[PDB]
Enzyme design. Structure first.
Site, mmCIF file in Angstrom:
data_model
loop_
_atom_site.group_PDB
_atom_site.id
_atom_site.type_symbol
_atom_site.label_atom_id
_atom_site.label_comp_id
_atom_site.label_asym_id
_atom_site.label_seq_id
_atom_site.Cartn_x
_atom_site.Cartn_y
_atom_site.Cartn_z
ATOM 1 C CG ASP A 124 -1.722 -1.553 1.045
ATOM 2 O OD1 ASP A 124 -2.412 -1.530 1.871
ATOM 3 O OD2 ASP A 124 -1.809 -1.901 0.236
ATOM 4 C CE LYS A 126 -3.371 4.484 0.293
ATOM 5 N NZ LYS A 126 -4.651 3.396 -0.115
ATOM 6 C CG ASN A 129 -0.842 3.486 3.464
ATOM 7 O OD1 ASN A 129 -2.083 4.181 4.600
ATOM 8 N ND2 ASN A 129 -1.348 3.081 2.891
ATOM 9 C CG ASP A 142 -2.114 0.130 6.144
ATOM 10 O OD1 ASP A 142 -3.358 0.767 6.177
ATOM 11 O OD2 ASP A 142 -2.005 -0.490 6.659
ATOM 12 C CB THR A 150 -5.162 3.554 -4.550
ATOM 13 O OG1 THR A 150 -4.832 3.844 -3.195
ATOM 14 C CG2 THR A 150 -4.980 4.838 -5.005
#
Length: 265
Positions: A124, A126, A129, A142, A150
């Site tokens: 994840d 991005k 995060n 995370d 996403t």
């Protein structure tokens, strides 16, 4: 080492965010030796525990202080990062200068490579995060899952379900760079399906205001074939760290958080 721990040992201040894996609150420990200390408490309605590593020791990865499963749900006590996330800042600033992007990406490069060394794939990646501490340094959050979102950040091999090694993270790292530098995503269609198809073609127009160094790094990261993407060995993350884009970066002092952040929360 953290077992007399209990949810009663923390007072709830407010809600920091709604995670997909669970809710996260701002809490204040009420018991010694760290009474008065602020933390972020992530509550999970599911269950595990074990001594998907959530306990990672690194300057650019959110640290886990306590972990106790009380009454079905699991409570994770993590660092509280005052600055919030990079998505919020990007939204306000609409785009960062190459100087700012270089710093964030350099610190992230170390954080990512570390997770990779522990066999973890930061699925994840991005701006949402990536958190900022009070000084302005970043902390990845995370993370964990090894054995496995996403769409705009999905690497081509992930869209085509062909595989998902750490290489996919470097592609996502490239998407982060592009979004921070331009305020927009490299591949985006009118819907999920078109976006995936655009990612697969990987046809990318380079905005002309980007430095030649930024442009070459992006081109090297946006290789459809994982095997030819920058970061795919043999020197691993080093080939990305030795890229002309980060020529002015002293990775030693960076690791030591000696380099001052561009933005001060």
């Amino acid at each position: 080492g953290s077992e007399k721990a209990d949810p009663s040992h923390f007072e709830l201040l407010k809600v920091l965010g709604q995670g997909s894996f669970g809710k996260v609150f701002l809490v204040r420990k009420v018991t010694r030796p760290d009474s008065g200390h602020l933390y972020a408490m992530k509550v999970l309605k599911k269950a595990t525990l074990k001594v998907i590593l959530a306990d990672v020791n690194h300057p650019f990865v959110v640290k886990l202080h306590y972990a106790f499963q009380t009454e079905g749900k699991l409570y994770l006590i993590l660092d509280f990062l005052r600055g919030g996330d990079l998505f919020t800042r990007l939204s306000k600033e609409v785009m960062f200068t190459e100087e700012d992007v270089k710093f964030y990406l350099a610190e992230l490069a170390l954080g990512l490579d570390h997770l990779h060394s522990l066999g973890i794939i930061y699925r994840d990646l991005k701006p949402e995060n990536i958190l900022l501490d009070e000084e302005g340094h970043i902390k990845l959050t995370d993370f964990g899952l090894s054995k496995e979102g996403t769409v705009e950040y999905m690497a081509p091999e992930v869209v085509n379900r062909q595989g998902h090694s750490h290489s996919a993270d470097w592609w996502s790292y490239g998407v982060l760079m592009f979004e921070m530098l331009t305020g927009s995503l490299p591949f985006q269609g009118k819907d999920r399906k078109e976006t995936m198809t655009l990612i697969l073609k990987a046809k990318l127009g380079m905005p002309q205001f980007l430095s030649t160094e930024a442009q070459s790094l992006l081109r090297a990261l946006f290789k459809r074939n994982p095997a030819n993407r920058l970061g795919s060995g043999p020197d691993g993350a080093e080939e990305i760290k030795r890229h002309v884009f980060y020529s002015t970066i002293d990775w030693n002092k960076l690791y030591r958080r000696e380099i001052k952040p561009p933005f001060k929360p």
